Amino acid sequence: QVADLKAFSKHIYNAYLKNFNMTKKKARSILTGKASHTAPFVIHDIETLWQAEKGLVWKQLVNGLPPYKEISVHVFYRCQCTTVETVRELTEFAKSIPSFSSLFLNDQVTLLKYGVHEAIFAMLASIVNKDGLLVANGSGFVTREFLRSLRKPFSDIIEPKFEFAVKFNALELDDSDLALFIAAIILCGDRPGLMNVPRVEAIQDTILRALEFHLQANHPDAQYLFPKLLQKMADLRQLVTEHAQMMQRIKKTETETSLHPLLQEIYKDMY
Amino acid sequence: QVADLKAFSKHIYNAYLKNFNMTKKKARSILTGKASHTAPFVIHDIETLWQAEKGLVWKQLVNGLPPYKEISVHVFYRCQCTTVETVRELTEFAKSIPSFSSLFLNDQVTLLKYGVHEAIFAMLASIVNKDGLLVANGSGFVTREFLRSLRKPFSDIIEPKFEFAVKFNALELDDSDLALFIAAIILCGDRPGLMNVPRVEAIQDTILRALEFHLQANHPDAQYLFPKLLQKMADLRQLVTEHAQMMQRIKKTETETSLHPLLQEIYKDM
Ligand SMILES: CC/C=C\C/C=C\C/C=C\C/C=C\C/C=C\CCCC(=O)O
Ligand SMILES: CC/C=C\C/C=C\C/C=C\C/C=C\C/C=C\CCCC(=O)O
């Protein structure tokens, strides 16, 4: 409808504002180039990465790439630590969504388990750039070249994402739309082992209808509006599948590196 | 021909559906409970009014308030803007009535001139509620409480309209009834300066005749509806009289506020 479908798209927008510290616009700010309000320390190589591990600080001792842990793996650990944290915000974010907490715990776990990476890779575009990614809560900025200059096993696990972030930022969405887009991916009725599918499917529908109208009063000048955004959701589904594939293999050949137990829980039923 | 009269009535009903941007049906559906609700943006204070102007919006008239135009006057401005727009629709409505378009334009104008406000108040009831009314295609809803909190002048030209609307809605009329009713108040033979009254009187007769026959096959189980509507017309003729007197007062007293050129024309000899 209107107000009800207005106070719905807004409640999910505030939930999105108080659960995610870095917002697309708060981040599109830094990457800008005219506003020196925040000049992100660029990396691009081992040296600056080493100092950054001080000038940007990080709870893991000054760097640390011993014979048991190398550079590329350190980026990996860095990356999975962030992911584990984004999973936390996504959990709190969803718990704020209208009929989400209504579902039984097990069903909430099933939705997060299968949608947290899709939402993550979507938010990733908000802090990304054609030439790099914004890290360390806006304070830092690692170049895309550096990441491509990583070992053979890893490296090609972050590239495909940039490809996504690029195209996805062409649509020019803002945090208000993004909030509705994320709620929609988390509340997906196609997740395996879901118990009350009819319920989820129903909550998803209004999310999408809310998104639908919201794009009408926000982006009146294209056609991507919904179909293209619905196709991205499908694109994202594949990005994750491919992502999960690379994760298992890494775990199978990179015995050296450790995988966080939570990401292991998420990965073990995705084929 | 008692028959083939329900046809002339359906044509009038088509003229009503094609020309008015808001019908009672679409209106009564907005003020619904919750089942497939809509819930219009509410305006009940200066804040929400400001939020409306920016959100629900309208267009031009967003003039300040302390200077040569204030809050109450801003509502008055939006009031006459909705009034000038309803007049345009009423003109098209009438022109979609062959019998009406037969007459000479000068006569047509005299009819639109002395009947447009009466029709505007009958219809007002369709978008009105016991507590407020819809605005901007039903997108908004202004409370009755707010309106009555305006400066004494503007506030009391609004109240009487509600008193009328509430009692009018008790009759429970649908759009097809209103079409006949509104056509009746416009093709009225007693209008000042009417040139060919015998012609008008006759079209009025047919409309009221079709009106009574339509109320036959739409409101079977019902009291003295037909004549009850004839007294409403009389009541409408009086409400417009006191409205014109109140408009008179604002023209002499609220010199700072401006009136639309078309509306001054309707009140010139009125
Ligand atoms: C508040 C931060 C919000 C949104 C930004 C989203 C994501 C940043 C985190 C990771 C992105 C970097 C690389 C992605 C590629 C591989 C990581 C796999 C992580 C994992 O083990 O689950
Ligand atoms: C939207 C038009 C369709 C259906 C309803 C019909 C008419 C209601 C329109 C305007 C009435 C609103 C406020 C009237 C109160 C004061 C202004 C009187 C102005 C005047 O004398 O011409």
- Which CATH number does the domain housing residue A202 bear? 1.10.565.10
Distance CA A93, CA B178 (A): 51
Amino acid identity at A22: M
Place of tokens 């046809």: B7
Closest alpha carbon to A239 in A155, A160, A132, A154: A160
Distance CA B129, CA B174 (A): 16
Name residues contacting ligand 2 (CB within 6 A).
B 20-22, 79-80, 82-83, 86, 117, 120, 123-124, 126-127, 157-158, 161, 243, 247, 263
Q: Which domain holds residue A172?
A: 1-271
Look at phi and psi of residue A226 and say left if phi exceeds 0, alpha if psi is from -120 to 50, else beta. left
Look at phi and psi of residue B108 and say left if phi exceeds 0, alpha if psi is from -120 to 50, else beta. alpha
Distance in Å, CA A208 to ligand 1 centroid: 25
Distance CA A75, CA A63 (A): 10
Distance CA A183, CA A261 (A): 25
Amino acid identity at B260: H
Contact yes or no for A93/A19 (Cβ under 8 A):
yes
Q: Exposed/middle/buried for A134, CB within 10 Å: 0-12, 13-18, 19+?
A: buried
What residues of B are in contact with residue A6 (Cβ under 8 Å)?
39, 41
Q: What share of chain B is helix, strand, coil (3-state, %, to 5)?
A: 65, 5, 30
Beta strands in B4-154 (DSSP E): 41-43, 132-135, 140-143
SS (H, E, C) A232-249: HHHHHHHHHHHHHHHHHH
3-state secondary structure of A57: coil
Backbone angles phi, psi at B133, to 5 degrees: -155, 155
Cβ distance of A2 and B36 shorter than 8 Å: no
What pairs with residue B143 in β-bridges?
B132
3-state secondary structure of B228: helix
**Cα R_g (chain A), whole angstroms:** 19
Look at phi and psi of residue B133 and say left if phi exceeds 0, alpha if psi is from -120 to 50, else beta. beta
CB of A127 closer than 6 angstroms to any ligand 1 atom = yes
Distance CA A12, CA A100 (A): 11
- Overall domain count for chain A: 1
Asked if B41 has any chain A CB less than 8 Å from its own CB, the reply is: yes
Token pair of A28 as six digits: 């599109």
Asked if B39 has any chain A CB less than 8 Å from its own CB, the reply is: yes
What pairs with residue A102 in β-bridges?
none
Cα pseudo-dihedral B14, B18, B19, B24, rounded to 10: 80
Asked if A221 has any chain B CB less than 8 Å from its own CB, the reply is: no
Q: What is the distance, to the nearest Å, from the Cα of residue B181 to the centroid of all Cα atoms in its chain?
A: 12
Distance CA A175, CA A23 (A): 7
Asked if B29 has any chain A CB less than 8 Å from its own CB, the reply is: no
Chain B, 149-168: which have a CB under 8 Å from a chain A CB?
Answer: none
Cited resolution, angstroms:
2.4
CA distances from B108 to A43, A259, B113 (A): 80, 85, 8
How was this one solved?
Answer: X-ray
Distance CA B182, CA B207 (A): 10
What residues of B are in contact with residue A210 (Cβ under 8 Å)?
none
First to last CA, chain A: 39
Distance CA A65, CA B83 (A): 77
Under DSSP, the state recorded for B174 is -
CA distances from A112 to A17, A32, A94, A115, A245 (A): 19, 32, 8, 5, 19
Ligand nearest B132 Cα, by number?
A: 2
